[PDB]
Design a protein around this ligand. Structure first.
Ligand SMILES: COc1ccc(O)c(-c2nc(N)nc(N)n2)c1
Length: 294
């Protein structure tokens, strides 16, 4: 793997570290994800390789999937900045609402695309959302959990982010649906608006309880079957739902209603990416140019 010259390390994902690198021969700049290790599931590299066919303006292009030295390398087109960095950079002033709306709209288009192709992300977070100078935003690292699975931590002892995990995952559901990505996106949307994580849990139970304290402890009324979920305990405290206008001020009612639909407890009631795109919140969507400091 010396076809490059690891320009630099740029991040650490749940499935592995990401590097910025230039191809010695072609001179192209790409992002290299190294996936943690002496076997690798059979259908894994096959399933991941299929992702190379995925082409959508809001999905980071997967250029190559190489298996060498028992290691797995994903070569991605390189985008210049991740949403986490941009959010931190915009923490004093905040991301303008029209830009937030644009990003949410584009992200939903990208999810609508993947979900229609039966591809789920399962680990969406600000770190794997990439932006460019032209106002586009793209999702990176889809279908990795389906091909592999959520490990103990990361390739090299890291603190996995739980803040964007859907409640059905926290409750131990064996089968998840595309609804998990809508939940994560809802959490990201809220964070872009308030400039603070919606549910910053430090543990799985703290994550779950933070959700409960805000949205109310779920019951059979709002979520049929929740009390029979694997990790559900009748001992969970019963918090009453908080007034929603407290959740994402000062987002307007259209944004709040859309967000509430993205955060429904029942995966079956949670809005789909396709239905969300038709929400009145996007009636006036535009495509602003962000102020990016590279
Ligand atoms: C699949 O993961 C990817 C794919 C393509 C990418 O450009 C990135 C990325 N890019 C930047 N600039 N920063 C950071 N932190 N990451 C990450």
């Amino acid at each position: 793997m010396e076809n490059f010259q690891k320009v630099e390390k740029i991040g650490e994902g749940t499935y592995g570290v990401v590097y910025k690198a230039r191809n010695k021969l072609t001179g192209e700049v790409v992002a290299l994800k190294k996936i943690r290790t002496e076997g690798v599931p059979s259908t894994a590299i096959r399933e991941i390789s299929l992702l190379k066919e995925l082409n959508h303006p809001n999905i980071v292009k997967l250029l190559d999937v190489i298996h060498t030295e028992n290691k797995l390398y994903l070569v991605f087109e390189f985008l210049h900045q991740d949403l986490k960095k941009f959010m931190d950079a915009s923490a004093l002033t905040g991301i303008p609402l029209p830009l937030i709306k644009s990003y949410l709209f584009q992200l939903l288009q990208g999810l609508a695309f993947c979900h229609s192709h039966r591809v789920l992300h399962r680990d969406l977070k600000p770190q794997n959302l990439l932006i460019n100078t032209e106002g586009a935003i793209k999702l990176a690292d889809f279908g990795l959990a389906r091909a592999f699975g959520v490990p103990v931590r990361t390739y090299t002892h890291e603190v996995v982010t739980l803040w964007y995990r859907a409640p059905e995952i926290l409750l131990g559901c064996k089968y998840y649906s595309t609804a998990v990505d809508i939940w994560s996106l809802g959490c990201i949307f809220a964070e872009m608006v308030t400039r603070r994580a919606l549910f910053p849990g430090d543990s799985e139970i703290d994550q779950l309880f933070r959700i409960f304290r805000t949205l109310g402890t779920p019951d059979e009324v709002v979520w049929p079957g929740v009390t029979s979920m694997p990790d559900y305990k009748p001992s969970f405290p019963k918090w009453a739902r908080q007034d929603f206008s407290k959740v994402v001020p000062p987002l307007d009612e259209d944004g709040r209603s859309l967000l509430s639909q993205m955060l429904h407890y029942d995966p079956n009631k949670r809005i789909s990416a396709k239905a969300a795109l038709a929400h009145p919140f996007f009636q006036d969507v535009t495509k602003p140019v962000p102020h990016l400091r590279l």
